[PDB]
Design a protein around this nucleic acid. Structure first.
Ligand SMILES: [K+]
Ligand SMILES: [Mg+2]
Ligand SMILES: [Mg+2]
Ligand SMILES: [Mg+2]
Ligand SMILES: [Mg+2]
Ligand SMILES: [Mg+2]
Ligand SMILES: [Mg+2]
Ligand SMILES: [Mg+2]
Ligand SMILES: [Mg+2]
Ligand SMILES: [Mg+2]
Ligand SMILES: [Mg+2]
Ligand SMILES: [Mg+2]
Ligand SMILES: [Mg+2]
Ligand SMILES: [Mg+2]
Ligand SMILES: [Mg+2]
Ligand SMILES: [Mg+2]
Ligand SMILES: [Mg+2]
Ligand SMILES: [Mg+2]
Ligand SMILES: [Mg+2]
Lengths: 260, 139
RNA sequence: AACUUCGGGAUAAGGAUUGGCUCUAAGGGUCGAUCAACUUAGAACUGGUACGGACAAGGGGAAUCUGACUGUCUAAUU
RNA sequence: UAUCUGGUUGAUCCUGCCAGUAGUCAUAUGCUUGUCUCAAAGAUUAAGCCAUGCAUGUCUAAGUAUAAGCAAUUUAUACAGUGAAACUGCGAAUGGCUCAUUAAAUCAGUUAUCGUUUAUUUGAUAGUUCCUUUACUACAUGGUAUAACUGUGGUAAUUCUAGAGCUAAUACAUGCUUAAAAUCUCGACCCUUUGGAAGAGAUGUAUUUAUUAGAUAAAAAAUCAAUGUCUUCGGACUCUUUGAUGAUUCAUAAUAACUUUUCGAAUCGCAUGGCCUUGUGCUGGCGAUGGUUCAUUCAAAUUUCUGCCCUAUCAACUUUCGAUGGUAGGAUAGUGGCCUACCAUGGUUUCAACGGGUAACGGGGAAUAAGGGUUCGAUUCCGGAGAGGGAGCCUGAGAAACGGCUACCACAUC
RNA sequence: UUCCAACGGGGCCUUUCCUUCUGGCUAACCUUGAGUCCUUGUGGCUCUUGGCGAACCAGGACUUUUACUUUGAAAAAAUUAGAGUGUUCAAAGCAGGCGUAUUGCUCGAAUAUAUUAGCAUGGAAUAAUAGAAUAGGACGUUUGGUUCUAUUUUGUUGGUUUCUAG
RNA sequence: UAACUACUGCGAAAGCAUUUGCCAAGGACGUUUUCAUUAAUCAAGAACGAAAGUUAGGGGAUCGAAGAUGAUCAGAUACCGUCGUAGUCUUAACCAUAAACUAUGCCGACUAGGGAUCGGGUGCUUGCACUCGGCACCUUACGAGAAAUCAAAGUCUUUGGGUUCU
RNA sequence: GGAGAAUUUGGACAAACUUGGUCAUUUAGAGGAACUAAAAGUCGUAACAAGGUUUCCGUAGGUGAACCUGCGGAAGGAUCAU
């Protein structure tokens, strides 16, 4: 329609932001940025809707223009900045550091982390190819170009990133036995060990994933994200740890809390 | 036969035979593995033909959908029509109906007659109609 | 186009083109050589956009009366 | 949320319809109407016509202030605060409206770009610019040419503008800048040696073409083009560099040139520090805007598969003057009869082509609902199209834009 | 617990495709350098030495072809069904709920359906399809011809006959 | 083309009846012959199709639309009576319809007694039985049906063998 | 000493207007000929009983009107019968 769209209607928003239907008509349209639109969480959502610090979209700007909040160690003044998976939101006041990571329902958790952990983030490597003057580089899932990587690093490997420097500290090869975070689909937010990979040339590779309670499931390779070795998560995981209980089993765990 | 029948000279682009390096082996004929377990015919590697649109000895890449169908016309030059038959479910009657579609297909001189079953691969638009290249013959 | 005895109506109606020059192509005969007609189609160029350049050469359509048609007669008013 | 009843007969059993019955985010209308919550609403006919008002503009510490503007209370003979105007930049391509067109079109799910463009965001990324490199060429910083503004005016009339005079830039147009080294061609000189060397030029990036590398299926040596090892010297004779894809002429790197020669910061704020050679020396922080390319994101364009209502009182359609394909070119961001030239005679169809109709925009959905179905979907979300009707087009990353222009047509204003 | 079963699932053997081979890796458990660590000898180990590779990855090598069905994945949100929640009830909404109510703790915003098409996967009944009949048929460590392909060498490019190796 | 002439035959139906030749055709039966799925039903498209009717030659006895004509009658160009044109027959062309009717599509299977009869075959004790295939018929109704009725009009709410048409 | 206005050649795109052609959709019309309301009026009496000539089908001719007659069918006949 003549050129790019600047609005987003509240119903056409991502469901996983959990915006109320009545209060509004539009919803905050993510600016262009590191993450894809439907996979992001605008800061205005994070501040106002999720943490309950701001009450309006004016107050979100009041907070952003003080230059408190910083995403991956750099200050941002954009209400609709597209923060996404593995990003570190650091507030100076409070001294709360959070990492955006999916709970099991497939929604961004309020996952508070220690100040040590906030030094780094993981990065799924998307493409690895040779740049100008023969200099090799990798491309992470948040679109960071990193030049001069370890030649062991191939596509689909995760890569630990220093943030301050923005350099590869360490990496994890994609193989059988590695822990995984599923970052899309029905099984968004589940955690589990890789079992084997199905090939399918000129198609979509699939990844069988066991979990701690011995429930297998398959996803597309595009939705998988390596996060460690077996029982050795590089980041801190949220409460649950990507388990997926039945609606029955969930309802039983409410009746423990119901006692009070 | 002939090869040089057209008004222009027929060559694979950016493939220099070089008269200076005098050797009586053969002309540099380029070819490629098409992919997806499709064998390059010997006729592609050995033969003299030039075809901008051949998926072995040309600049087209096979990607997207692989389809099969019976050959129903071989009267165009370097292209054919195939018939893909199928059954279409009508849910009110819990029954099917035979439908069909014709798909025009580029055929390299590597290969085909009326009656033959062929596998064909999707490629960039080659003509007004043709978006498919013969990549295997099975009769 | 109506209509029709299916033969017609019909050149229906209604349009476009046409010179000069320089070329190209196709179409043959006789023993690969050799000999020879005009026909047709195309292209470039060119001009006071002319050009079936004089001559030669249908106006057409919608209906009605009437005799079917070609044919014949009042030489000197039909 | 699986139900029927009245109506042909003198009476009967049927067929069979008519009538009843209930629903309708389904319109109108009649009569009637206290309260709370919620709330559709010029779609249907006329995508008919429209008076008036308004619906798009925008400024920070940080492009341009001599407002003959407001201050000033004293941060300043350059400016320094707060600021009309105008230039510059960005936006005005979103939104909102409507449903006329449109029936393999749109649209839905599903693919593809190894078939392309992409403002912006985010992440990377630029010692190689003078060319006589001993004439000049400022880099302690280069050229005019203009607005607002001040005057002089026209016009019945408009977001009309002429003439004259000033003057800014992140506008416009120029133009220097700063480490080594390696490698290539050229080659002075001497010496015919399995000869080698001053010093000469070039080597960023982008542009265009041609060429080259971009290996790999396991173990042996013959025979040397030999004329290069490494001097153990019978010439031991090894070790070499090679990323990605299912797949490439991919990425990338060379080589030779090419270019109405692209870019490679003459820009702006707030801090004012460190060295001393106390000259306005050298060096230096936080970050604004800018910029080449790659990546990214927001997109865009094209695209694969299957799916659409009634109609045969539409059975053949397409191909002159692109129909289907081939070759080459042109054009495009790019693929492609997209267009041109030449050549072939193809392409669709009773499994319904082609044609006609639609009181047809598609879909998510809605109504009714034993099960199966039937009917509706102009309308809150998604996609498309349009802005009286047609066509053309400037600007710009993006428009064939209409609260942009140009023309014709229709309508209408002063 | 073992056993009484029923019902389902996998692997063996029985004239029994359970694609084939070529290096990764032999994990393992009839490989045993210290045997009795140890509930009814069917409720069993401390590892060395080629191993036995169907436990598990990419390679050439060629693979009758569908339909149907299972599971998975997909099929925006809203709407539909539907869980939780005293909006005073309800239509709704996505809230809310417990504290020392004096500087705070906490559960949520599920789940299901949506085929026809395409994708991945298990099954091989049903229904179609192909194969050796003028054998141009199958398997083959044979036994020749013939046809190209090029790897570590033989210094290294290159010329270049072979042994190979496919 | 009488009588013979029938609840008899043949034919896809329309239809087909004196004798004898000639020409091809066909069902059924018999078969330890042959091929091996070649089939069933069929939009489109075709052949044949009573009578009447049409065109042009032949023919033209009889009957007879029209018409003439005598009665009847209120009328009677109606029935009745006497004549009579086309027609009735044939050759070459057309026409394409009928209560063209069993008012019952075709193919296949199954469900129940009975005797007659036509064609072929087999056994015989030579006129009877069995058998296949036909035209029908009688009883019952298991079933079916609104009923009349129906051995198909049955095997349909216990609802699905295949298929055309309306 | 390079920008650069009017103007202008050829080109593609091409509105719009004449002009035929064609398809679709509405609509006027003297007069004509039907149909229905429709059952009542006029004239008969064709059908229903052997409906007073059994009825009906196809066809063909006749004609105030129902109808009548020929040829060939049918029984849905007034005969399941020698
Ligand atoms: K005459
Ligand atoms: Mg819009
Ligand atoms: Mg005429
Ligand atoms: Mg004429
Ligand atoms: Mg005359
Ligand atoms: Mg006279
Ligand atoms: Mg081309
Ligand atoms: Mg419409
Ligand atoms: Mg709609
Ligand atoms: Mg409408
Ligand atoms: Mg309007
Ligand atoms: Mg538009
Ligand atoms: Mg416009
Ligand atoms: Mg407007
Ligand atoms: Mg607008
Ligand atoms: Mg028929
Ligand atoms: Mg009939
Ligand atoms: Mg009577
Ligand atoms: Mg009577």
């Amino acid at each position: 329609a003549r050129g790019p769209k600047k609005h987003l209607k509240r119903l056409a928003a991502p469901h996983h932001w959990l915006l109320d239907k009545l209060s509004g008509c539009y919803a905050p349209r993510p600016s262009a940025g590191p993450h894809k639109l439907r996979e992001s969480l605008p800061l205005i959502v994070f501040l106002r809707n999720r943490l309950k610090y701001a009450l309006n979209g004016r107050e979100v700007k009041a907070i952003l223009m003080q230059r408190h909040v910083k995403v991956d160690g750099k200050v941002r003044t954009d209400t609709t900045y597209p923060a996404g998976f593995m990003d570190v939101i650091t507030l100076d006041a409070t001294n709360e550091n959070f990492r955006l990571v999916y709970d099991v329902k497939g929604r961004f958790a309020v996952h508070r982390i220690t100040d040590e952990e906030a030094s780094y983030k993981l990065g799924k490597v998307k493409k690895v190819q040779l740049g100008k003057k023969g200099v090799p580089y990798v491309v992470t899932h948040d679109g960071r170009t990193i030049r001069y990587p370890d030649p062991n690093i191939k596509v689909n490997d995760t890569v630990k990133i220093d943030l301050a420097s923005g350099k590869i500290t360490d990496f994890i090869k994609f193989d059988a036995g590695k822990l995984v975070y599923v970052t899309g689909g029905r099984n968004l937010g589940r955690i589990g060990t890789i079992v084997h990979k199905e090939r399918h040339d000129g198609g979509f590779d699939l990844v069988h994933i066991k979990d701690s309670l011995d429930n297998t499931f398959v996803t597309r390779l595009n939705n998988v994200f390596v996060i460690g070795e077996q029982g050795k998560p590089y980041i801190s995981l949220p409460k649950g740890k990507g388990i997926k209980l039945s609606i029955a089993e969930e309802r039983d765990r409410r009746r423990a809390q119901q006692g009070l | 036969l002939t090869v040089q029948s057209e008004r222009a000279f027929q060559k694979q682009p950016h493939i220099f035979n070089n008269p200076k390096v005098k050797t009586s082996k053969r002309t540099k004929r380029w070819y490629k593995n098409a992919g997806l377990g499709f064998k390059t015919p010997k006729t592609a590697i050995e033969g003299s033909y030039i075809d901008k649109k051949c998926p072995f000895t040309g600049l087209v890449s096979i990607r997207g959908k692989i389809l099969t169908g019976t050959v129903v016309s071989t009267k165009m030059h370097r292209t054919i029509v195939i018939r893909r038959a199928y059954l279409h479910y009508i849910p009110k009657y819990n029954r099917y109906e035979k439908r069909h579609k014709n798909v025009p297909v580029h055929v390299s001189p590597a290969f085909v007659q009326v009656g033959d079953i062929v596998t064909v691969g999707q490629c960039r638009p080659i003509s007004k109609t043709v978006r498919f290249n013969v990549v295997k013959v099975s009769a």
